[PDB]
Amino acid sequence: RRTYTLADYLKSTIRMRNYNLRWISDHEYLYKQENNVLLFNADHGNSSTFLENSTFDQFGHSISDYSVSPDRQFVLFEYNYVKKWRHSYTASYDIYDLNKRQLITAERIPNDTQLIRWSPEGHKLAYVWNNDVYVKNDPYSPSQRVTHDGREDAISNGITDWVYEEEIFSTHSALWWSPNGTFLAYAKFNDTDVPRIEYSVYLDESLQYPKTIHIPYPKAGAKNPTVKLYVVNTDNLTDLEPAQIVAPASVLTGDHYLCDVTWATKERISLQWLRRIQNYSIIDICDYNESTPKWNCLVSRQHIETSATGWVGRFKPAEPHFTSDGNSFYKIMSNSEGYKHICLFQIDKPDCTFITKGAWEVIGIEALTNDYLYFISNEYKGMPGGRNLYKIQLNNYANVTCLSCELDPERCQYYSASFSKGAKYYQLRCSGPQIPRYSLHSSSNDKELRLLENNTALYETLQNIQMPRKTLDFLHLNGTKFWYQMILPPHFDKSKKYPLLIDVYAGPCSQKADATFKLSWATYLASTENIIVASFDGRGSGYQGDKIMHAINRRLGTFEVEDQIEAAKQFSKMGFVDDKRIAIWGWSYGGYVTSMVLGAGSHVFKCGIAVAPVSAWEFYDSVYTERYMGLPTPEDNLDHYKNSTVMSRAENFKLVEYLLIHGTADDNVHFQQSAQITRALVDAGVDFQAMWYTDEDHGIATSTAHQHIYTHMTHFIKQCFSLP
Amino acid sequence: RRTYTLADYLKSTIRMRNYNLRWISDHEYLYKQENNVLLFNADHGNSSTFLENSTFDQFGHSISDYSVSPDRQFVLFEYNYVKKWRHSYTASYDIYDLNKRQLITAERIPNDTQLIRWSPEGHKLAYVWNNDVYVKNDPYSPSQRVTHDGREDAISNGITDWVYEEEIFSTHSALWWSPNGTFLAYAKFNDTDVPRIEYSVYLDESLQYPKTIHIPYPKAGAKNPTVKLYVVNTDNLTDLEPAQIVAPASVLTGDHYLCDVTWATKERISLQWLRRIQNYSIIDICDYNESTPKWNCLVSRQHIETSATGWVGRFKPAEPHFTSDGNSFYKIMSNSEGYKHICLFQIDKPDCTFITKGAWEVIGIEALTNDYLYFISNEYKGMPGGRNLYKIQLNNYANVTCLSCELDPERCQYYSASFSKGAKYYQLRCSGPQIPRYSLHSSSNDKELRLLENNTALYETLQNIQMPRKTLDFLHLNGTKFWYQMILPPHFDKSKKYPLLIDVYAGPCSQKADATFKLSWATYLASTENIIVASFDGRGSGYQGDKIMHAINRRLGTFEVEDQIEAAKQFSKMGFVDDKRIAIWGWSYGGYVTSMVLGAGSHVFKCGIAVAPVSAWEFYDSVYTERYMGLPTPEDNLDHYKNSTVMSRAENFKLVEYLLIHGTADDNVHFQQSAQITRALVDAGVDFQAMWYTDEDHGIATSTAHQHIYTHMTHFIKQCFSLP
Ligand SMILES: *[C@@H]1O[C@H](CO)[C@@H](O[C@@H]2O[C@H](CO)[C@@H](O[C@@H]3O[C@H](CO)[C@@H](O)[C@H](O)[C@@H]3O)[C@H](O)[C@H]2NC(C)=O)[C@H](O)[C@H]1NC(C)=O
Ligand SMILES: *[C@@H]1O[C@H](CO)[C@@H](O[C@@H]2O[C@H](CO)[C@@H](O[C@@H]3O[C@H](CO)[C@@H](O)[C@H](O)[C@@H]3O)[C@H](O)[C@H]2NC(C)=O)[C@H](O)[C@H]1NC(C)=O
Ligand SMILES: *[C@@H]1O[C@H](CO)[C@@H](O[C@@H]2O[C@H](CO)[C@@H](O)[C@H](O)[C@H]2NC(C)=O)[C@H](O)[C@H]1NC(C)=O
Ligand SMILES: *[C@@H]1O[C@H](CO)[C@@H](O[C@@H]2O[C@H](CO)[C@@H](O)[C@H](O)[C@H]2NC(C)=O)[C@H](O)[C@H]1NC(C)=O
Ligand SMILES: *[C@@H]1O[C@H](CO)[C@@H](O[C@@H]2O[C@H](CO)[C@@H](O)[C@H](O)[C@H]2NC(C)=O)[C@H](O)[C@H]1NC(C)=O
Ligand SMILES: *[C@@H]1O[C@H](CO)[C@@H](O[C@@H]2O[C@H](CO)[C@@H](O)[C@H](O)[C@H]2NC(C)=O)[C@H](O)[C@H]1NC(C)=O
Ligand SMILES: *[C@@H]1O[C@H](CO)[C@@H](O[C@@H]2O[C@H](CO)[C@@H](O)[C@H](O)[C@H]2NC(C)=O)[C@H](O)[C@H]1NC(C)=O
Ligand SMILES: *[C@@H]1O[C@H](CO)[C@@H](O[C@@H]2O[C@H](CO)[C@@H](O)[C@H](O)[C@H]2NC(C)=O)[C@H](O)[C@H]1NC(C)=O
Ligand SMILES: *[C@@H]1O[C@H](CO)[C@@H](O[C@@H]2O[C@H](CO)[C@@H](O)[C@H](O)[C@H]2NC(C)=O)[C@H](O)[C@H]1NC(C)=O
Ligand SMILES: *[C@@H]1O[C@H](CO)[C@@H](O)[C@H](O)[C@H]1NC(C)=O
Ligand SMILES: *[C@@H]1O[C@H](CO)[C@@H](O)[C@H](O)[C@H]1NC(C)=O
Ligand SMILES: *[C@@H]1O[C@H](CO)[C@@H](O)[C@H](O)[C@H]1NC(C)=O
């Protein structure tokens, strides 16, 4: 029987399908099929061809994306897509009028447009061009320029800078339409005094001279960009200047962040602010006073969230989900025991009321109606690495009803959901630990309407392959239960002793051990090279309580490192793991941990790989770093900024085999970091291996580069484990 | 018996001494001994302490170097040394009076001084600070400012830019005093429109953001800097200005280089100009007029040098060696048979007379007397790799007497000399093949006056070691003699079979197969690991004829590559070479040839190492590249610029093991060149090994890095050669 070879991983020979849809109603969604865009109605099961693939290639050129207007009158076509960063880009957009079924030729959308978003209702447009905000009341209507200070690397209106897109918003967008489309809320960023990172780009062999790329990148303690929030009335845009909503006073004592903007009603806006010392968060509720007319942000509806053991939220404070009347909201907060649970806020009330509790966390709030609230939790079977859909009755909080627990309990233990408007229907997505699945459900009776994708083709293709097995198990460290996972080789024999390879992230609020089904590189090693690939969620991990999560606070590189070693020591006690063939590798925080582990002097690991590793917290951006480590000042936390460098551990690298990989175009984890490591390894008489990948970004993902780094790492591990 | 250990190379426990001296008279020379500067009198032989080691330490700073005035009244002390580039720096200077045993504190020399030069007679000073020339007729005097348009990276007066420093002048100085100290000639460079290479420098772990380093670097085809030559009357300057000496019309038809400036008499100057297409140079003899025009350059005394087969000279045209009257000069030129020989030029007459001939070349003219001319050639036994001192009676060209050939014909075959003023005495300098030896001679009888350094302790300390033996042999390629060297392991047994390591430079006018004595890394591989290390000098090599050397013209990366292969194949046919264990490595042109050899698909070499290689001549500087490859224009030589890249040979790297090393702060061979290779090797799916060295220049020389790179390369060889 065939095995999962390396070519099977790198060539995507074994494709896993999914089912991605866009709810455009309370009962209709769009789905792309055979390059056609089909419009499905879940209330009747009937579906029409909404957008022929004929009218996708008959424009002049290849179209990259689409976005249909909420009134289904116009379609945006995106083409000439040029990648900027993780979530950012610039492209040209066309407008396709569906009433005439004709392409719009006048009042077009300029080339090099950065952002674009429809209004929630109707057909109004807002786009960002040369870092300025423009609005179009109609595709057949001239643009209205809102801002005029758009300066590259200085001022951005409506689009995020680098740190916000990466570490806060997780999207390039800084436009927020009002539900009626009357108001637009946009953010203005100012990176004028933010220091710049500079790295060279060695483009095609034609380029005689390299390019120098500049990016405003505040490192730990550096000058941070400012943000201001302005609101604009689209219906009477030529009456007043954009109205700034000043941040609350609580956050104005120094530098601060803007982390979320949500619309409660057609005339009420909510702003989540965050201090720079990220243990203080506040929600401001602002109503439109049509008199002056200003935005009236009453103090009595300010809502504070703090943390005594560290920072607020998991990565950033939870976003509020307002009720249909915008006079209350539900947001996730840590209870007294330190577990993320759902709390009920009244806009005018100073306290919140918890509606869920237990020794388990709530992952997120998925949908909200007047009678039920839908959410995801890791409560089922007390397994933190699982995800299941629940619903809460808003009259009797004791009446919690899991919607995914008993559907296929052996095959599916990791669910997610995508709801429609008003939570009439919801798409269920199972991710593991067996073959994924996608189904359509109706919230009225929670019955499966139809099976969207079963991956049956995947199922039979794996039947002919000696696939490895994934075990979800746990262990105890100083009396605390800690979960881990093992990818076991096929025909696993506990009497025989296998080599061990540890996959690390160990990042704050990370979770590497979970009931998810992946066709990864580890799948190759176990199925073919018969290597046990493990991952251990120790201290600093998430979804297990603020006790375990905040243990790493202000002490990065201390406990998440020891516990990877200590768990590795536990694995040796088992009778099926070779003591002399234990390895480790990571990526962008594992590479930090993997490096910091090999420098611990543990005599546990034989070799290691660090891919785009962090080497010192002095080098990473302030938003992620200062959240867990604070400021590098002698008065705040400068001590452990220095005590936690990989370079301080060079001498102990004489005992292991180090392989260091890093891409040169890395805008996230700068090549400066790996360079500082090698200088410490060189200056210490330590021999090691290295490999750069030219013009590859942080997540090395170019087809040629993705295949090369893993084919390189396979040779390394096989040489370290003395494998064929 | 012990062997030459790797630690013996990297730690230099087994030191080799040398005798370095500064002739300050016709019979006196300065010599440093235990940090004391001693004055020696060659005539009788006695000695006296000229400068105590109390100094260099009694002043508040460690003194790097010293320089004594010709009239022996003042001494310069160099401190605050900050290395700029290869031959450049910037440092601070203190002036010390000898008649008063005092340190001058009035009218001091500024810090951050970029150059300093004494007049050849008297004690006139000339230093360059902020790219402007300042002059002092006496150390106790103010500094008259000559130029005022100095600007960083834009204009340089008196100091070279990068390309002139590296590829023409081999010095940072662009000052030329007249013999009487009356005139000062200085050149002015303009890099205003020359593109700037940029690379990042990752300083100490405490240095948060990296520093971008800009350097005016004209790559092949780019805009070269302009150069103008001015002369100043130092005696009466407050009245007069500098006087420009315009280049000949022969050279003003385009871009041109200034390659030499020599003072014939107190009022006569010789300028060597060079066309950008380096097959046309001219010497200009310019006389001083007591009225305007300040400098009268007669047309009838222009002297022009051309080459129809390639470029002019070896690296640059030979410099002229004037007679005492300045009415004639000897210089090295190619004859009709293509052999560099000495020619006698007469200023006014347009032809020259060869005073030497034969199928061998002259290396350099060492000294000129009114009766004899001393020079260095490779005539003895027809060995190009040997150097000996000869002398010609300037009356009887037939009386050509060797002064070193038959001293120790078994120990010494690679001589050089450092003559005194007027050539009364000359230090003989033997460099191999056996242990070096330094002796002092008298010109009147060529009789050894005394033995300066015999390296006796080095002789004894070597007999404790199984030291290798180096053979200088030759082979015929297509009926053309080609020489090679073989470092042979001790106790050589031609019945056995040895691994083969081919050290490659193979650059134009290069010589890797000589009769010199080096304690190198090749010694370790032969003494300890029993590896034969060979070096072959094929087509493109110098000192053998312009037929052999200019065969590389406009065809770089073609013939010097193939010849290395076939010589290795001829090494394969030998009975003592393991065909399956042949490897090759090189540095900075060898890395180019090594990479180009491994890409040829010859199945000859098993593995290879390329350290700081050239990947594409499009990326190297113009002065070097255009000299041998022409212009990368579709009309001149664009094609073999394209055809000669390493990246075009990526596929054939699947058959060899490849290790690529490069310094991140390399300004000579930019990191871009290595990065372009890996991208082609990544795009071809070829696995290889790489290793960067942060902030290491082209000649990776940091004490820590130098050990790490040779240690890293040894592991690669042993693994490739299947050794312990
Ligand atoms: C974007 O940010 C930059 C810098 O973060 C802002 O410009 C800077 O504004 C400050 C004051 O806010 C200026 O500093 C000093 O102001 C005092 C006032 O007494 C004055 O006396 C000093 O001479 C000095 O100017 C600073 O000069 C200025 N820097 C600039 C203009 O480069 C800028 O206003 C921000 N823009 C937006 C749209 O947010
Ligand atoms: C150092 O080199 C720079 C760049 O070559 C010199 O400045 C440049 O001079 C040229 C003229 O040779 C200017 O080009 C154009 O000339 C035409 C002639 O009609 C004129 O119409 C244009 O308006 C322009 O002047 C060029 O602008 C100028 N570039 C600058 C000043 O940045 C410079 O003179 C050289 N310096 C020395 C000391 O030799
Ligand atoms: C969208 O909502 C806004 C605010 O609710 C509407 O604006 C107000 O509309 C009311 C009546 O609905 C008027 O009495 C006010 O004079 C309006 N004030 C402002 C500032 O607009 C807006 O008309 C609504 N638009 C649509 C298309 O529903
Ligand atoms: C948020 O964290 C900061 C520092 O991490 C806390 O600042 C402390 O403030 C008190 C004043 O009440 C000082 O006495 C301490 O010295 C401060 N600590 C440091 C390390 O500077 C702040 O109290 C925290 N906020 C909350 C609400 O817990
Ligand atoms: C959807 O795919 C699953 C596989 O994940 C199918 O379930 C298997 O069906 C076979 C029948 O031959 C049983 O023997 C297996 O035990 C089942 N496995 C699991 C994990 O349930 C299922 O039949 C497919 N459904 C459809 C409609 O095709
Ligand atoms: C060492 O060489 C020096 C060279 O300067 C000799 O210098 C002598 O200096 C005295 C001083 O009055 C003169 O009178 C002599 O004429 C110099 N000698 C010569 C040869 O010129 C010095 O003599 C030498 N050493 C000794 C011990 O005499
Ligand atoms: C150095 O040489 C220069 C030129 O050879 C001398 O300058 C000339 O000196 C003579 C007589 O002293 C004058 O008639 C000329 O007018 C001078 N010409 C110039 C250009 O200066 C100079 O005097 C000599 N100085 C020394 C110290 O030897
Ligand atoms: C110096 O080199 C150039 C370039 O190789 C030579 O220019 C050639 O000249 C001949 C005759 O004028 C032309 O037919 C060629 O087309 C020229 N080649 C180029 C590339 O322009 C020039 O002749 C050489 N100089 C000497 C003295 O031989
Ligand atoms: C100078 O050094 C050379 C070699 O470095 C010495 O020459 C050797 O001398 C020994 C006698 O002890 C002979 O056995 C060797 O055959 C000699 N070798 C050569 C190449 O000649 C020489 O003795 C040293 N001279 C002094 C004065 O120390
Ligand atoms: C376009 O859609 C039709 C609908 O069946 C399908 O047959 C055809 O293959 C599609 N073409 C492309 C290029 O996707
Ligand atoms: C489904 O049927 C209803 C009623 O028959 C119709 O109004 C609707 O348009 C149909 N769906 C589509 C996508 O046309
Ligand atoms: C200085 O010179 C004296 C005289 O020979 C010598 O004894 C001493 O060791 C020297 N000191 C240094 C530091 O070179």
Side-chain angles (χ1 to χ4, degrees), chain A residues 198 203-206 208-209 212 219-220 222 618 645 672 675-676 678 683 686-691 694 708 712, chain B residues 198 203 205-206 208-209 212 219-220 222 618 645 672 675-676 678-679 686-690 694 704 708 712:
Chain A
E198 298 151 14
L203 270 182
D204 252 358
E205 193 172 341
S206 78
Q208 190 177 43
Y209 295 93
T212 293
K219 289 182 169 176
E618 193 195 36
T645 65
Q672 158 209 22
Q676 282 280 4
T678 62
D683 292 334
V686 171
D687 196 62
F688 63 95
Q689 290 220 117
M691 167 74 61
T694 166
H708 195 265
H712 193 56
Chain B
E198 306 177 11
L203 284 178
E205 170 199 358
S206 82
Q208 188 149 45
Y209 296 94
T212 297
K219 293 183 175 183
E618 180 194 45
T645 57
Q672 164 197 20
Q676 287 290 340
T678 67
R679 169 199 163 83
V686 186
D687 192 52
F688 58 98
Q689 314 264 110
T694 89
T704 67
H708 188 288
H712 198 270

Side-chain angles (χ1 to χ4, degrees), chain B residues 180 182-183 233 235 266-267 288 290:
Chain B
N180 242 26
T182 304
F183 289 117
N233 193 325
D235 279 334
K266 310 174 186 173
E267 298 180 344
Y288 178 77
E290 212 215 20

Side-chain angles (χ1 to χ4, degrees), chain B residues 529-542:
Chain B
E529 313 289 354
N530 290 315
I531 305 185
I532 303 183
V533 191
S535 310
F536 178 69
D537 281 337
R539 277 178 292 188
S541 48

Side-chain angles (χ1 to χ4, degrees), chain B residues 30 54 85 194 268 333 468 676-677:
Chain B
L30 288 167
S54 166
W85 335 115
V194 182
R268 188 174 305 189
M333 301 235 308
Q676 287 290 340
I677 286 183

Side-chain angles (χ1 to χ4, degrees), chain A residues 353-382:
Chain A
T353 285
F354 282 89
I355 82 180
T356 70
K357 72 178 181 306
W360 51 281
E361 289 196 357
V362 169
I363 301 305
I365 305 188
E366 301 296 326
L368 212 173
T369 69
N370 307 269
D371 277 336
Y372 296 117
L373 185 163
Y374 298 75
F375 75 102
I376 307 283
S377 72
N378 57 358
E379 187 189 26
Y380 187 63
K381 292 180 175 170

Side-chain angles (χ1 to χ4, degrees), chain A residues 194-200 202-212 214 217-223 616-620 632 641-642 645 647-648 660-662 664 671-676 678-679 681-696 702 704-705 708 711-712 715 719, chain B residues 194-200 202-212 214 217-223 616-620 632 642 645 647-648 660-662 664 670-672 674-676 678-696 702 704-705 708 711-712 715 719:
Chain A
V194 175
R196 308 236 188 92
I197 189 60
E198 298 151 14
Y199 59 82
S200 312
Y202 316 99
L203 270 182
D204 252 358
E205 193 172 341
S206 78
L207 243 195
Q208 190 177 43
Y209 295 93
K211 300 175 171 183
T212 293
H214 310 254
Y217 193 90
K219 289 182 169 176
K223 276 175 186 169
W617 295 117
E618 193 195 36
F619 298 160
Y620 203 61
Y641 265 105
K642 295 177 174 176
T645 65
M647 290 74 67
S648 61
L660 183 55
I661 306 185
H662 209 145
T664 51
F671 187 90
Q672 158 209 22
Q673 305 223 52
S674 298
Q676 282 280 4
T678 62
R679 186 187 160 84
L681 300 180
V682 159
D683 292 334
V686 171
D687 196 62
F688 63 95
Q689 290 220 117
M691 167 74 61
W692 72 79
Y693 280 93
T694 166
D695 286 3
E696 288 298 339
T702 304
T704 49
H708 195 265
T711 306
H712 193 56
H715 296 339
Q719 277 177 345
Chain B
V194 182
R196 324 204 109 76
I197 181 65
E198 306 177 11
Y199 58 80
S200 309
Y202 314 98
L203 284 178
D204 307 51
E205 170 199 358
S206 82
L207 191 272
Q208 188 149 45
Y209 296 94
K211 289 182 186 161
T212 297
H214 314 274
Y217 191 96
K219 293 183 175 183
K223 263 175 212 156
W617 296 114
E618 180 194 45
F619 300 150
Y620 204 55
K642 291 182 173 180
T645 57
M647 291 79 87
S648 58
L660 187 82
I661 309 188
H662 210 123
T664 66
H670 294 147
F671 187 94
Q672 164 197 20
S674 295
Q676 287 290 340
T678 67
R679 169 199 163 83
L681 286 178
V682 166
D683 293 332
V686 186
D687 192 52
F688 58 98
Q689 314 264 110
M691 169 71 53
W692 70 78
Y693 284 98
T694 89
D695 297 4
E696 292 302 331
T702 311
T704 67
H708 188 288
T711 291
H712 198 270
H715 292 284
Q719 283 190 309

Side-chain angles (χ1 to χ4, degrees), chain B residues 58-346:
Chain B
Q58 84 94 350
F59 307 101
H61 332 96
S62 168
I63 279 163
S64 168
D65 200 354
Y66 72 108
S67 188
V68 196
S69 60
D71 56 333
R72 274 181 249 194
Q73 259 189 111
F74 302 83
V75 200
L76 289 176
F77 288 141
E78 170 169 295
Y79 60 84
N80 296 347
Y81 180 87
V82 178
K83 193 168 186 303
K84 204 67 189 323
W85 335 115
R86 177 185 291 242
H87 303 306
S88 56
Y89 38 79
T90 168
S92 302
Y93 297 91
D94 267 331
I95 314 180
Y96 183 80
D97 194 326
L98 292 181
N99 315 120
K100 297 193 177 184
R101 272 170 163 262
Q102 285 222 38
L103 189 62
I104 304 178
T105 61
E107 318 289 347
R108 303 160 60 99
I109 298 182
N111 299 304
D112 305 313
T113 310
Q114 309 168 266
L115 190 64
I116 189 95
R117 284 290 179 275
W118 285 107
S119 63
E121 301 178 9
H123 51 215
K124 298 201 197 175
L125 272 181
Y127 60 92
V128 181
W129 178 65
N130 296 331
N131 305 24
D132 296 320
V133 174
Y134 300 80
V135 162
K136 302 173 58 159
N137 299 346
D138 176 291
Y140 305 101
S141 313
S143 312
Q144 299 165 106
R145 180 182 183 171
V146 173
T147 69
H148 51 246
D149 56 359
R151 189 192 227 268
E152 193 184 9
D153 292 341
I155 298 283
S156 309
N157 304 296
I159 41 186
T160 67
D161 58 349
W162 192 95
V163 277
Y164 275 64
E165 169 184 44
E166 182 77 23
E167 309 292 340
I168 307 178
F169 281 12
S170 301
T171 172
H172 206 37
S173 147
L175 299 193
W176 301 272
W177 280 95
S178 59
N180 242 26
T182 304
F183 289 117
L184 202 183
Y186 68 85
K188 144 152 41 183
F189 308 91
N190 188 11
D191 304 86
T192 302
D193 277 351
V194 182
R196 324 204 109 76
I197 181 65
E198 306 177 11
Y199 58 80
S200 309
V201 157
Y202 314 98
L203 284 178
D204 307 51
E205 170 199 358
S206 82
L207 191 272
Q208 188 149 45
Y209 296 94
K211 289 182 186 161
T212 297
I213 288 204
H214 314 274
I215 289 177
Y217 191 96
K219 293 183 175 183
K223 263 175 212 156
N224 278 329
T226 77
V227 52
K228 318 181 184 305
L229 194 274
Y230 291 80
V231 184
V232 156
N233 193 325
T234 298
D235 279 334
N236 182 18
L237 212 174
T238 172
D239 263 38
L240 276 207
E241 330 92 279
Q244 186 195 355
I245 302 189
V246 201
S250 324
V251 86
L252 260 45
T253 88
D255 297 320
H256 51 280
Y257 306 114
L258 183 271
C259 34
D260 180 60
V261 172
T262 302
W263 280 96
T265 67
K266 310 174 186 173
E267 298 180 344
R268 188 174 305 189
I269 186 175
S270 152
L271 310 180
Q272 273 224 250
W273 301 91
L274 213 173
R275 287 191 180 177
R276 201 195 165 111
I277 316 193
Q278 306 194 32
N279 58 358
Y280 188 95
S281 82
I282 178 182
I283 309 180
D284 221 357
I285 316 283
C286 300
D287 279 311
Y288 178 77
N289 194 339
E290 212 215 20
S291 68
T292 326
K294 335 83 181 173
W295 293 92
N296 209 74
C297 305
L298 260 57
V299 167
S300 67
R301 50 187 53 172
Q302 287 176 350
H303 295 276
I304 292 172
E305 198 174 329
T306 70
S307 175
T309 51
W311 64 96
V312 173
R314 303 201 171 109
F315 300 125
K316 65 166 194 174
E319 59 288 345
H321 295 275
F322 285 96
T323 38
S324 173
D325 49 50
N327 301 327
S328 52
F329 60 95
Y330 304 75
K331 79 179 284 295
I332 296 178
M333 301 235 308
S334 311
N335 63 31
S336 53
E337 294 81 356
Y339 285 83
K340 255 71 179 171
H341 280 297
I342 306 182
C343 215
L344 202 184
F345 280 91
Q346 312 255 307

